[PDB]
Amino acid sequence: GSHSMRYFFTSVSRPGRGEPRFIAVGYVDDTQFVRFDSDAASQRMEPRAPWIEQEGPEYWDGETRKVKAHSQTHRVDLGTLRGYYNQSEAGSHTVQRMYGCDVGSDWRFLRGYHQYAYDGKDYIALKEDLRSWTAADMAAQTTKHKWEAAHVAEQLRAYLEGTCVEWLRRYLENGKETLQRTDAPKTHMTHHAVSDHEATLRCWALSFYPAEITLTWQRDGEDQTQDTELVETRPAGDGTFQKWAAVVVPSGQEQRYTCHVQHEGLPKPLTLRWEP
Amino acid sequence: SLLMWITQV
């Protein structure tokens, strides 16, 4: 179906330390494929997906130089932001940046992004039209002014609509077996007595990909949205994800409830019901 | 592939 490529960058100042910590990671859909850690020994962009190891020396040297440049730019940003907010050099602060593109089922450009945050909150973001910026506060107005004067959006739009989508396509092809796959969830239900007149029913979805999934409980045909305990979708560690939803029901009424699982890996949604 | 030209805030 639709796909995306995204790069995430985190830079953390470390007062008393010689250099801040910079970590960059790249993803195609829900699969990470590269990483860089400024504290690491190699000082090079590293492969984290089998299909990216195919790229030659030219690719790696280029990605390494560009990521080291990113690191340097963010090292400067930390100081700049401390100034915009007139903060002390004594505290640790965080900068995060994310950019990438989305393509539709036809693998053609759908949307582009470039967002930035300081200390966990929105700072500045490129609007959907890829022509203007949204500044979160007064401080960010200086950056907005700076980026408008240097025509940043225009130069960036070219990457988002061109380079980004072109490499995403190349990755989707080179990593077909991995990226263009869907692993349908393996589902099952567990029963756990609670009180003496109550029991917990837990619906499980395991080993699925992509991460997008919908688990819902119903009691005699009606949604139990409010009374459903749902956990965040979590990584199994092997490239697939997991999730569960639970409801507490009166003993002897378990059969009245049904769990519904929706995932693109399923030809049709599944319905599970407790079976003694 | 990473963006090449990045601008400071």
Epitope: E19, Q43, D61, G62, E63, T64, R65, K66, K68, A69, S71, Q72, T73, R75, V76, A150, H151, V152, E154, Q155, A158, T163 | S1, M4, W5, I6, T7, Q8
Partner: T-cell receptor
């Protein structure tokens, strides 16, 4: 990947409006910069045109960029003896990861008093 | 701006020396060039940030280091007559307009 400046030499009477040419083989550039250098001296930046833009002006100097045609033109109005120097044109790559500029060999200009 | 020193220097063959280049614009990119008659400007070494340096067109005989954001020293461990030239340091952002800023130049003559 190759920047050329032809004519490589130009002689003009004071007061005339002149035109200096720049050509590059790869249109994927981030910007184009014009400089002037006098013998025994350093390089002074004149104009910088970003690849998304069309032209830049500074006093009697005006330059245009035609990225699709792989060319740039530097115009100097009402030339003066002091404009005499070697004008260099350079471009930087949009991609690649080196950020290394490519310079033309320049056009030597002499404006006769 | 960009400040490079010394402006003039004489060296005997085999002597070592370092040309300094400092910039206070927070530029990530810094580089060194040598310019000689009929050769144009040739890139020696460059750096896109602290802790990274790469070879240019004519790296042989020169060494650089980028321990800090502001400085990009060019060192000649053992000066040779072929290194007599005019050296230019150039810096810029790795974004924004990407404008290059050249230092004033350093003239070096290496004699036997």
């Amino acid at each position: 990947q190759e920047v050329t400046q032809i004519p490589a030499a130009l002689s003009v009477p004071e007061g005339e409006n002149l035109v200096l040419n720049c050509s590059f083989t790869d249109s994927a550039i981030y910007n184009l910069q014009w400089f002037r250098q006098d013998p025994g001296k350093g390089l002074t930046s004149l104009l910088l045109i970003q690849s998304s833009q069309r032209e830049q002006t500074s006093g009697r100097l005006n330059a245009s960029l035609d990225k699709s045609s792989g060319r740039s033109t530097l115009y100097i109005a009402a030339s003066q003896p002091g404009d005499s120097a070697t004008y260099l044109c350079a471009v930087r790559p949009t991609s690649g990861g080196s950020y290394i500029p490519t310079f033309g060999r320049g056009t030597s200009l002499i404006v006769h008093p | 701006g960009v400040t490079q020193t010394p402006k003039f220097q004489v060296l005997k063959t085999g002597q070592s020396m370092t040309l300094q280049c400092a910039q206070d614009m927070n530029h990530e990119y810094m580089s060194w060039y040598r310019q000689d008659p009929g050769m144009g400007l040739r890139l020696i070494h460059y750096s896109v940030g602290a802790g990274i340096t790469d070879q240019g067109e004519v790296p042989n005989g020169y060494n650089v280091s980028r321990s800090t954001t502001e400085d990009f020293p060019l060192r000649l461990l053992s000066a040779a007559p072929s290194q007599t030239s005019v050296y230019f340091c150039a810096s810029s952002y790795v974004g924004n307009t990407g404008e290059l800023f050249f230092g004033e130049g350093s003239r070096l003559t290496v004699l036997e």
